Design a protein around this ligand. Sequence first.
Ligand SMILES: CC[C@@H](C)Nc1ncc(C(=O)Nc2cc(C(=O)NC)ccc2C)s1
Length: 338
Amino acid sequence: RPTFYRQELNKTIWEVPERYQNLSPVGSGAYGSVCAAFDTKTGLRVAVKKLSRPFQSIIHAKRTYRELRLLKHMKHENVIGLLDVFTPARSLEEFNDVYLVTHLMGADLNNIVKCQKLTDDHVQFLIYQILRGLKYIHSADIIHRDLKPSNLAVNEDCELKILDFGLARHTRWYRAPEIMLNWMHYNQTVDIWSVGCIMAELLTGRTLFPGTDHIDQLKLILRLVGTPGAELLKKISSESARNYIQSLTQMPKMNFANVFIGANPLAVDLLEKMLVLDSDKRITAAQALAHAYFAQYHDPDDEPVADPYDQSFESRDLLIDEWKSLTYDEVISFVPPP
Ligand SMILES: CC[C@@H](C)Nc1ncc(C(=O)Nc2cc(C(=O)NC)ccc2C)s1
């Protein structure tokens, strides 16, 4: 065991091992109860997240178990990984707190683009890294579901890591329409749509689709990608959806080259491949990585897939204490990095 140390930041109290000094409440709890700290053992700066009421209900206990499992699985340069997970409980019996530790990233895209648009080479390198991380997560059947600029962490290096993946469900500005509009089905390409919206924002400096709500959002998307065609409506299982869609004013798809003027045309062609309404036609992360727009960074031999990930628990309906014990088991068997 290690020697812990109490303290109270904001209003919450924190009990971490002594190897973690200088805890300072980071990014307005936007990433949750996270503190920046110094790793006395690695001499590196890490981010410390104390889960909020980890086992108050079944649902919380399940989300806690889900989080730990996901973080323990992530072993990739472009996806946040687990440096350490600890609890101040000497027993499963008194296990009520969870703390997760990852590398500390400098900033997130929600702010850096808020300093005016980016250069094309900056977009190539950032979007490239997102696609590499996405290729890895999707290869394990994990979907981020809420890819957003504040969910993309970068260092001064422009080194990029995806965060907060696979938590959402089982903001709308970046959401794929097959999620907005009722639920005409979907897949992992729901993340590609988000990357499309993000890339667009980075290139222009403006929110591609600044929706006011679900209906205003959809309306903004169709204006750009156009009204759903016959091949698309043929695949819509939702009678509800087929009504709305087939009833609103028919809009043609616009010329991206005209909407994104002066942008690297290679970039425009890629945006065309990501921003398609039909989720079966959207480009994949793996395919996108081979897009000429990334000629300068692409390397098939260094774009790894992930080991398989056991998501069967997702289907289980257990008691709070059973999720707790499972979480406890996961904390216990944790094996740090190299
Ligand atoms: C980019 C924002 C700036 C302020 N720095 C940051 N570095 C790292 C941050 C972070 O959230 N780490 C983190 C992410 C997850 C996660 O992704 N769970 C699925 C879980 C726990 C932690 C501790 S935030």
